[PDB]
Write a protein that binds this ligand. Structure first.
Ligand SMILES: [Cl-]
Length: 278
């Protein structure tokens, strides 16, 4: 508690370290008056491991998309500090896409077909699309490999890891349907135009808030309130501009308000339902 530890869920810590260190370097000196003297970065491979870090006090603060953030809240390990705006957008949503020449035109026609998802900690690439399928009564069994096939009447899903893989697998006719966020859709690292032109969007989910700053269970209340004040004033500090760009292009932070609290409550119910029935 003389150290502030920032992290995130990361399948690529070599790359993501640089996203975190600049804002941490900005924050730490502004926290002296609450006993912080130094900073550290600690990332984890998935929500379950990050949750264990959080609960054990090894990580203090993470910035995550809201579904992942609810996984951490449900596991007893953290709570919301601030709503976060990235790329100028407060919200995002999941889209389902196929090859243009696919016979699939709606979400219901997933029955009989395969779906490329990301990993269990993804909001837009796992939690939201699985929630959507549960709501529509569309069964979706885990498939073991690209040779495996769904039951008739059911869909099936394959975990391919990365967002690009979701695009690549559907493009190359290995899986029928992909799930990515509407923001991922226009991001060329995740959805190359050479694949994108061969795709058609078949369904959109309702939006959720894009991201949230979470802090661990049992953080000292003085540290928590000061971190909040620091981050709230960073967005208008020019001294924080480059750091924020690097921190997932964060363009805003704001207080939790009754609306955002209720939306997180709704999303958390949905995430809990996904976890209970997957
Ligand atoms: Cl909101």
């Amino acid at each position: 508690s003389s150290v502030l530890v920032l992290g995130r869920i990361s399948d690529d810590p070599a790359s993501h370290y640089e996203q975190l260190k600049p804002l941490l370097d900005y924050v730490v000196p502004r926290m002296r008056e609450v006993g912080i003297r130094r900073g550290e970065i600690l990332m984890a491979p998935d929500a379950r491991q990050m949750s264990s870090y959080l609960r054990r006090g090894r990580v203090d603060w993470v910035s995550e998309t809201t579904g992942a953030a609810m996984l951490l809240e449900q596991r007893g390990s953290a709570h919301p500090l601030l709503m976060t705006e990235r790329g100028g957008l407060r919200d995002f949503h999941t889209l389902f896409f196929v090859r243009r020449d696919s016979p699939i035109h709606s979400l219901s026609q997933l029955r009989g077909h395969t779906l490329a998802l990301q990993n269990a900690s993804s909001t837009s690439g796992y939690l939201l699309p699985m929630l959507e399928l549960l709501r529509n009564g569309i069964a979706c069994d885990v498939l073991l490999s690209a040779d495996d096939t769904p039951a008739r009447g059911s869909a099936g899903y394959l975990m391919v890891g990365s967002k690009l893989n979701v695009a690549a697998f559907v493009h190359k006719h290995l899986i029928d349907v992909g799930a990515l966020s509407n923001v991922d859709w226009d991001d060329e690292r995740h959805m190359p135009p050479v694949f994108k032109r061969d795709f058609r969007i078949v369904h959109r989910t309702a939006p959720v808030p894009r991201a949230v700053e979470m802090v661990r269970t049992g953080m000292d209340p003085a540290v928590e309130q000061r971190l909040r004040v620091v981050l709230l004033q960073a967005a208008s500090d020019p001294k924080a501009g480059p750091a924020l760009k690097r921190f997932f292009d964060t363009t805003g932070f704001r207080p939790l308000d009754p609306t955002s609290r209720r939306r997180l409550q709704e999303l958390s119910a949905g995430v809990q339902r996904v976890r209970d029935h997957v």
